[PDB]
Amino acid sequence: MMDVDHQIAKLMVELSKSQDDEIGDGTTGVVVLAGALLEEAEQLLDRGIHPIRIADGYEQAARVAIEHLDKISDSVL
Amino acid sequence: NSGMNPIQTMTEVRARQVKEMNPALGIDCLHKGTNDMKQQHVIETLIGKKQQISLATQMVRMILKIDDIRKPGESE
Amino acid sequence: ELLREAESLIAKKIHPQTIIAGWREATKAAREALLSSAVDHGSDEVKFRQDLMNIAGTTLSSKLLTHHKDHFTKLAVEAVLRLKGSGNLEAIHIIKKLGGSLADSYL
Amino acid sequence: APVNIFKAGADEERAETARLTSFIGAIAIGDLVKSTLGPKGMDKILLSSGRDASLMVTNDGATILKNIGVDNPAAKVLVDMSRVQDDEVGDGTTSVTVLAAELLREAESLIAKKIHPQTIIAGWREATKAAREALLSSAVDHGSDEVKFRQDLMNIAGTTLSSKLLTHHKDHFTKLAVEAVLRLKGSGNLEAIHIIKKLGGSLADSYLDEGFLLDKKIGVNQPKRIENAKILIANTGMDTDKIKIFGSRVRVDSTAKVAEIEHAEKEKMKEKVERILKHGINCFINRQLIYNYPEQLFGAAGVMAIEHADFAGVERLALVTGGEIASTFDHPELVKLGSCKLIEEVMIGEDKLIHFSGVALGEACTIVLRGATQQILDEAERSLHDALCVLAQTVKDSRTVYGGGCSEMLMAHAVTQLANRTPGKEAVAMESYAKALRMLPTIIADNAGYDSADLVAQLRAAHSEGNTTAGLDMREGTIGDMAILGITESFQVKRQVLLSAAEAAEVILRVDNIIKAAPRKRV
Amino acid sequence: RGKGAYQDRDKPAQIRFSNISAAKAVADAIR
Amino acid sequence: RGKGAYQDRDKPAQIRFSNISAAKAVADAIR
Amino acid sequence: TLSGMESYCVRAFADAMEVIPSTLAENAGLNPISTVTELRNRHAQGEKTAGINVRKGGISNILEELVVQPLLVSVSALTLATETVRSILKIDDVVNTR
Numbered sequence: 052m053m054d055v056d057h058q059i060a061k062l063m064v065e066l067s068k069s070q071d072d073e074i075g076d077g078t079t080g081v082v083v084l085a086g087a088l089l090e091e092a093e094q095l096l097d098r099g100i101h102p103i104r105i106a107d108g109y110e111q112a113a114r115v116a117i118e119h120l121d122k123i124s125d126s127v128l
Numbered sequence: 129n130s131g132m133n134p135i136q137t138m139t140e141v142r143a144r145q146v147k148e149m150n151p152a153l154g155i156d157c158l159h160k161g162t163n164d165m166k167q168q169h170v171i172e173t174l175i176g177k178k179q180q181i182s183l184a185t186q187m188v189r190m191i192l193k194i195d196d197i198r199k200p201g202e203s204e
Numbered sequence: 205e206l207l208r209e210a211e212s213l214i215a216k217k218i219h220p221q222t223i224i225a226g227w228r229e230a231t232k233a234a235r236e237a238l239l240s241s242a243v244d245h246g247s248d249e250v251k252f253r254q255d256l257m258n259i260a261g262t263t264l265s266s267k268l269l270t271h272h273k274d275h276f277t278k279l280a281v282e283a284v285l286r287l288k289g290s291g292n293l294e295a296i297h298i299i300k301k302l303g304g305s306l307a308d309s310y311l
Numbered sequence: 312a313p314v315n316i317f318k319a320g321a322d323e324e325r326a327e328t329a330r331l332t333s334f335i336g337a338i339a340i341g342d343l344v345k346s347t348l349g350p351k352g353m354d355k356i357l358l359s360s361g362r363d364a365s366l367m368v369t370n371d372g373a374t375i376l377k378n379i380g381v382d383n384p385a386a387k388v389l390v391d392m393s394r395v396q397d398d399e400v401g402d403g404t405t406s407v408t409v410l411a412a413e414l415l416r417e418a419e420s421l422i423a424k425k426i427h428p429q430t431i432i433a434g435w436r437e438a439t440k441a442a443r444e445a446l447l448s449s450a451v452d453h454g455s456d457e458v459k460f461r462q463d464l465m466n467i468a469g470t471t472l473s474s475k476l477l478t479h480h481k482d483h484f485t486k487l488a489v490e491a492v493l494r495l496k497g498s499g500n501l502e503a504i505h506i507i508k509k510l511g512g513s514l515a516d517s518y519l520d521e522g523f524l525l526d527k528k529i530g531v532n533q534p535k536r537i538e539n540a541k542i543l544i545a546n547t548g549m550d551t552d553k554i555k556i557f558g559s560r561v562r563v564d565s566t567a568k569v570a571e572i573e574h575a576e577k578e579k580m581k582e583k584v585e586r587i588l589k590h591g592i593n594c595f596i597n598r599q600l601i602y603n604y605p606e607q608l609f610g611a612a613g614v615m616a617i618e619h620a621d622f623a624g625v626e627r628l629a630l631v632t633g634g635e636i637a638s639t640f641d642h643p644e645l646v647k648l649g650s651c652k653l654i655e656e657v658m659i660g661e662d663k664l665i666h667f668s669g670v671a672l673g674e675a676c677t678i679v680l681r682g683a684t685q686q687i688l689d690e691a692e693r694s695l696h697d698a699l700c701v702l703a704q705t706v707k708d709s710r711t712v713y714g715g716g717c718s719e720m721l722m723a724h725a726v727t728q729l730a731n732r733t734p735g736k737e738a739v740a741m742e743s744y745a746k747a748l749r750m751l752p753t754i755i756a757d758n759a760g761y762d763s764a765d766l767v768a769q770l771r772a773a774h775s776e777g778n779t780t781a782g783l784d785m786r787e788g789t790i791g792d793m794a795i796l797g798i799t800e801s802f803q804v805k806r807q808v809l810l811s812a813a814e815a816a817e818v819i820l821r822v823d824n825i826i827k828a829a830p831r832k833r834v
Numbered sequence: 835r836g837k838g839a840y841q842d843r844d845k846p847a848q849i850r851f852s853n854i855s856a857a858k859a860v861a862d863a864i865r
Numbered sequence: 866r867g868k869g870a871y872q873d874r875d876k877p878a879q880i881r882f883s884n885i886s887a888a889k890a891v892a893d894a895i896r
Numbered sequence: 897t898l899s900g901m902e903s904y905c906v907r908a909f910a911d912a913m914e915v916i917p918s919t920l921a922e923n924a925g926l927n928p929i930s931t932v933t934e935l936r937n938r939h940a941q942g943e944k945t946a947g948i949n950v951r952k953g954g955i956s957n958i959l960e961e962l963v964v965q966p967l968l969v970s971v972s973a974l975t976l977a978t979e980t981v982r983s984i985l986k987i988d989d990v991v992n993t994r
């Protein structure tokens with residue numbers, strides 16, 4: 052329900068919509084996390100690191116976060 | 129948002145997950161006594177947090193792999 | 205007046221979620237004050253009709269019908285008393301006609 | 312007057328928007344400089360729209376209000392109130408602005424209580440009289456035993472500079488402010504302490520000069536340093552005199568007589584310099600400009616010549632050397648000369664300044680402020696000016712009170728003790744006067760980030776049973792004794808905060824009609 | 835004693851005179 | 866216990882990020 | 897060796913000192929990720945006169961390349977910049993003067 056005419060921030064709108072369409076609980080936390088990954092990449096951008104090299108480093112880092120999250124998980128419904 | 133300090137609270141919870149095996153250790157607003165999320169019954173879905181890390185990484189990859197903006201000026 | 209007192213808690217540096225959690229316990233205690241002080245009326249219907257005129261006398265006192273409580277209270281109590289059932293609030297058709305004073309109105 | 316309005320372009324309001332615009336415009340002034348009060352308050356940066364904006368950061372409340380240009384009519388009373396506070400005592404301009412705004416904020420709470428506004432004026436006059444006796448009975452005097460008075464003066468400068476940009480420089484700037492007024496040894500003229508701002512270096516590199524610094528360096532072919540010299544200053548014309556006869560021409564018959572007149576003009580200019588060197592001097596300071604013909608005469612005799620220092624530059628040299636102005640040279644036995652040791656030139660920030668090292672009877676100082684930017688030097692000059700003006704009046708009035716919230720709780724206790732001995736018509740207005748006095752330690756406590764709801768409650772419980780020296784400790788965030796920590800302020804500074812805010816809140820509360828006229832060239 | 839003081843600093847004391855002066859113009863128009 | 870809570874609902878937390886972002890543009894201009 | 901909130905700011909002070917070798921390595925066409933990392937490895941061993949060699953295109957001895965900087969240049973660049981940034985976090989309120 053915003054009038055943001057910015058094509059980068061429009062992708063944050065579709066990110067919160069895609070979390071609502073698939074799961075529907077973490078639409079707020081998926082925007083703070085995406086803004087946190089881009090804020091930490093700002094200091095890495097000034098050090099001469101390539102932006103695709105940061106993007107290739109995030110895929111190898113997010114793969115560890117998926118496998119570690121599946122350690123303790125149980126329900127008896 | 130709970131009124132605490134971000135350094136004084138995140139350093140204590142993260143240090144307790146290394147000295148022992150990593151528990152369900154988070155925070156809360158009224159804090160409910162201890163910081164154990166298993167005792168406070170703060171339960172979230174696995175596929176909810178799995179898609180939070182997966183979708184935010186792919187959206188960052190599409191806004192890091194861009195080096196040109198071709199927007200127009202005025203409307204007419 | 206709740207938000208005017210909440211504006212006074214701006215300069216006191218009170219967290220706004222503390223005011224929400226403080227008012228939820230305050231509203232829960234305020235429900236018990238009205239529930240324990242409520243006066244019921246079952247049988248002995250000669251005191252319930254006197255109680256109904258006190259309800260219409262309090263509502264019409266804050267309106268334009270100030271010095272008409274000797275007439276408009278009987279026009280409001282006996283209108284619902286002639287329903288003898290559900291409060292449909294459409295069988296009481298109010299017809300407004302010019303001419304005459306408010307004391308000339310009748311049921 | 313709104314109904315059937317008989318005005319051209321002027322508007323007005325009576326008792327509905329009159330007190331509404333007066334309470335909005337005065338609280339927003341006090342809430343503006345609310346964040347600059349206390350030893351942990353932040354500062355403001357003032358900027359214009361353009362056309363030589365000349366940004367000037369200030370923490371003092373008088374310099375903020377004198378440059379904003381408020382359009383509200385009732386807000387200009389609080390702007391003019393802080394201007395007098397800077398001109399009289401030089402401190403408490405921020406404290407008198409928040410206190411005058413908290414009185415009208417408590418008076419806005421008496422709008423819905425249907426209290427008559429003349430009852431609040433009569434209730435605050437009795438509250439101000441009870442608050443004068445609280446500061447007068449708690450004032451600490453200092454007569455003899457001067458080793459305790461010099462320690463008391465460092466607590467005054469340490470309290471004033473703690474609320475400014477000089478936070479972690481109290482080990483140096485307190486000695487630069489106490490010893491500057493201590494070298495005056497007389498009246499607080501507040502102009503013998505010439506502050507020179509030079510870029511380059513940190514604030515710790517600043518110092519108090521033992522002598523005196525000047526500009527307009529010594530001639531062309533004149534000596535730069537003379538040991539054990541006799542300084543004679545002047546305020547007379549050297550060349551192109553045109554001496555005091557308007558309507559006098561040189562009407563001659565031939566051009567050979569013009570060469571005799573212009574040689575006679577240079578002989579009288581030479582004879583004037585010959586009357587100066589009969590005193591036996593080595594340095595010469597003229598307020599006016601010195602041209603080339605007397606400059607060659609001082610250079611041939613080995614005499615310095617400082618030309619066109621300042622109009623107030625010869626006044627500071629007369630107080631630092633012990634001489635006189637001496638604008639007429641016809642009696643060498645009635646002209647007192649100055650005294651010095653070294654007139655060497657020093658270089659501060661790639662600029663050669665004339666250093667009058669080793670002067671006798673030096674009742675003048677020179678503070679060499681060095682900062683990182685020009686914005687720091689403009690702030691440190693006003694921060695030192697807010698510290699030297701209090702010490703110039705502390706030596707005239709040695710009465711001091713315990714600051715840091717301790718003086719405000721003593722004033723609020725005397726009002727609350729007499730609010731219970733009054734009938735209920737004026738007792739509600741006296742309780743609002745005591746609540747506004749407790750807001751001044753509440754703004755200081757909340758600016759640091761402490762629990763202001765509990766620290767002022769601990770101050771009110773302490774002052775209710777003894778503890779006349781208990782105040783707010785901003786170092787650790789607790790309640791401590793103000794006589795031990797050494798946080799004191801002057802009596803005349805704290806009296807002018809109480810008295811001027813009570814008089815300014817009396818004017819705005821008595822306004823029931825704001826009739827503004829039609830402005831010019833505003834369409 | 836004065837037995838109280840009721841300060842009334844509000845709007846409608848002036849609007850009440852506006853309804854009076856407007857109704858006087860109607861009665862003087864058809865006078 | 867939490868031992869207090871300091872609610873800071875005021876302006877200059879956002880203006881402090883404006884002075885940082887303006888000074889970063891000057892350092893990247895003459896980098 | 898410090899603790900509390902002071903230990904997180906000296907690390908922020910030390911990480912801001914690595915910008916000038918990151919600036920010098922990026923302007924020289926070298927990789928600034930591995931240049932500043934190799935410079936911290938040489939100074940940890942004891943090489944106090946190590947730096948960026950723009951002639952060889954790497955890390956070598958500075959005094960061999962005759963690159964001499966005075967002490968007053970680098971001390972006043974650290975003293976005046978720290979005193980400036982200690983005031984910008986203290987001076988923060990936008991007041992537009994009319």
Ligand SMILES: Nc1ncnc2c1ncn2[C@@H]1O[C@H](COP(=O)(O)OP(=O)(O)O)[C@@H](O)[C@H]1O
Pocket residue numbers: 075076077078079080081154155156157168170
């Ligand atoms: N009792 C609690 N204690 C601690 N944290 C909680 C508690 N309840 C909720 N939270 C946190 O609040 C967050 C709320 O996220 P939310 O905004 O609902 O995400 P989304 O926008 O995707 O629905 C969750 O990530 C959760 O970790």
Ligand SMILES: Nc1ncnc2c1ncn2[C@@H]1O[C@H](COP(=O)(O)OP(=O)(O)O)[C@@H](O)[C@H]1O
Pocket residue numbers: 347348349350371372373396401402403404405406407469470471473474714715716755783784785798
């Ligand atoms: N060391 C300290 N301990 C406690 N309070 C202090 C200390 N230093 C200054 N203060 C308080 O900070 C306030 C600063 O007021 P200030 O803005 O200087 O007023 P003004 O603008 O009129 O000079 C003073 O009222 C004083 O009580």
Ligand SMILES: [Mg+2]
Pocket residue numbers: 262263266
């Ligand atoms: Mg009603």
Ligand SMILES: [Mg+2]
Pocket residue numbers: 402403470471474697
């Ligand atoms: Mg002060």
